[PDB]
Design a protein around this ligand. Structure first.
Ligand SMILES: [Zn+2]
Ligand SMILES: [Zn+2]
Ligand SMILES: [Zn+2]
Length: 572
């Protein structure tokens, strides 16, 4: 009930009772807060409320100290001092940005801008407040009760009346009733239960609302620059394969933390695993937010690092199937691969945090609190997709506001940049290099002459809000008949409902742009589906077209992105 002020660290017995996270506020900052916001409840050992029987005055600005107790203007004794005076709130041990973080509903982009441009302590207050708001918002949704079980992969649902229905995609995971986590895709609905269970008729599902823990560690530790490589011992015999990253691996040992911007297919996991070969005795913890990112790091480690020194950390709540080729839950192995949410409390010579555009400041802080390392390496790309912000409906969130690492990469630049894309045909590399990389990304491959674009608006229909463009899928079907090599293509679009329709009509494996990030395929067929801020987002567009190793077909809706594609146009 006594602690440090979130704005100036000054000790206090005061906590704001109207703030969802009840932060400690000192006398000067508590005053500036209550006198400028709707927040008037102040908490101490006992709350600041009128002690007179049956009185409901709780507003600190309307209360006084009558001896050792608190009373309003109607109940105070003659000798009483106002709780609010001379810019202070009376307590013990006797902000415009804090006010906005404390009172916003997190539905605007400007709220996330502020959460990332503020002081470090306010970045943690903002991340805690936002995550708690995101969880209390899960309570504000309807329950789905099983009406009829059709097959082992399909069922019918009855929804709660008076409460909205959550979007049925992979971004919304329900907990079944504790009969395992379940996911849904669109009267017949498709069910994907993490645990294989005979889906009982009438049993209910509810979105998991986890408790938001407080943040202690900064999003980024204070930067330290060294004169020599510190606490790391380089090999003198470094494999030719990894020679291109030697100057960068040295930069890593000569700073507390370093940022690496790696565009698609420029060698991020090769850099991450090569860092272990460069400092062969260093204990490295490899972390990312998703199980897919962590597994991709495991796949790369399996090829270069001794398997007996690797461990994949998987929590007892085994959400989805992940990497099976390392000893499980051996926290003490030299190489530990683990998602941010499952991190043990341990130390490391190097912590490598991959897919950094997907991290939030909450994730950045958790890593700093669970892992005490000599060096921290942040690998990702601010030109790729950020983590979904479920509350954000108004405005677009720019890359410089994704998190603290992305803010640094977009303002002062990354410490290291992988400049040569080895995956994509040059048509794709030249397009994204100009689009999001200021012409600094170079192509290793020649033009494949298998990159096509077709400008076709089609017809936009909707499955609630998720969009479908059947004419664009018809154009793909026509193209496939004339281009049989493309039979092996992955169908990509910005919408799951478009992908569900393409799956049935084309039979191609399907992927949203957001679920394709980090993956690569020989051929990609992309249908833009709509002209929305979502389907036109340059980061999403960047990820979409950089999935292709050999060919890409883009059926476009937006003239701007279509005209920028350095692809051969097709007719019809
Ligand atoms: Zn203060
Ligand atoms: Zn408050
Ligand atoms: Zn009173």
């Amino acid at each position: 009930a006594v602690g440090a002020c979130v704005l100036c660290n000054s000790q206090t017995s005061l906590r704001c009772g109207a703030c969802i996270r009840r932060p400690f506020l000192c006398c000067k900052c508590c005053y500036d807060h209550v006198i400028s916001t709707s927040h008037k409840l102040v908490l101490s050992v006992n709350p600041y409320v009128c002690n007179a029987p049956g009185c409901d005055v709780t507003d600190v600005t309307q209360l006084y100290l009558g001896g050792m107790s608190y009373y309003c203007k109607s109940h105070k004794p003659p000798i009483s001092f106002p709780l609010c005076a001379n810019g202070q709130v009376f307590g013990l041990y006797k902000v415009t940005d804090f006010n906005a973080i404390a009172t916003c509903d997190w539905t605007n982009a400007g709220d996330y801008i502020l959460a990332n441009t503020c002081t470090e302590r306010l970045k943690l207050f903002a991340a805690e407040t936002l995550k708690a708001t995101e969880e209390t918002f899960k309570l504000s949704y309807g329950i789905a009760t099983v009406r009829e079980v059709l097959s082992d992969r399909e069922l019918h649902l009855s929804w709660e009346v008076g409460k909205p229905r959550p979007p049925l995609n992979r971004n919304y995971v329900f907990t079944g009733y504790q009969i395992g986590e379940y996911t849904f895709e669109k009267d017949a609905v498709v069910y994907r239960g993490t645990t294989t269970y005979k889906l009982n008729v009438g049993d209910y599902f509810v979105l998991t609302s986890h408790t938001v823990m407080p943040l202690s560690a900064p999003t980024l530790v204070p930067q330290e620059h060294y004169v020599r490589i510190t606490g790391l011992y380089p090999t003198l015999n470094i494999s030719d394969e990894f020679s291109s990253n030697v100057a960068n691996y040295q930069k890593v040992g000569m700073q507390k933390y370093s940022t690496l911007q790696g565009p698609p297919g420029t060698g991020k996991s090769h850099f991450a695993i090569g860092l272990a070969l460069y400092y062969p005795s260093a204990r490295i913890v490899y972390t990312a937010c998703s199980h897919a990112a962590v597994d991709a790091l495991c796949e790369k480690a399996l090829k270069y690092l001794p398997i007996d020194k690797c461990s994949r950390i998987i929590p007892a709540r085994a959400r989805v199937e992940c990497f099976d080729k390392f000893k499980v839950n051996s926290t003490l192995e030299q190489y530990v691969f683990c998602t941010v949410n499952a991190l043990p409390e341990t130390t490391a010579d190097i912590v490598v945090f991959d897919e950094i555009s997907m991290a939030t400041n909450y994730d950045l802080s958790v890593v700093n609190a669970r892992l005490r390392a000599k060096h921290y390496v942040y690998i990702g790309d601010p030109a790729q997709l950020p983590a979904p912000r479920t509350l954000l409906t108004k405005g677009t969130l720019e890359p410089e506001y994704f998190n603290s690492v992305c803010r640094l990469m977009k303002t002062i630049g990354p410490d290291m940049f992988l400049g040569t894309c080895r995956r994509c045909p040059a048509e794709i590399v030249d397009t994204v290099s100009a689009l999001v990389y200021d012409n600094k990304l170079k192509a290793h491959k020649d033009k494949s002459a298998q990159c096509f674009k077709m400008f076709y608006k089609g017809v936009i229909t909707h499955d609630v809000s998720s969009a479908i463009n059947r004419p664009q899928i018809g154009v793909v079907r026509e193209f496939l008949t004339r281009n049989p090599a493309w039979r092996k293509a992955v169908f990509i679009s910005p919408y799951n409902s478009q992908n569900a329709v393409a799956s049935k009509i084309l039979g191609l494996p399907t992927q949203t742009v957001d679920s394709s990030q980090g993956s690569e395929y020989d051929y990609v067929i992309f249908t833009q589906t709509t002209e929305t801020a979502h389907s036109c987002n340059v980061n999403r567009f960047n990820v979409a077209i950089t999935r292709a190793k050999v060919g890409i077909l883009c059926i476009m809706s937006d003239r701007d992105l279509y005209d920028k594609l350095q692809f051969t146009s097709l007719e019809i």
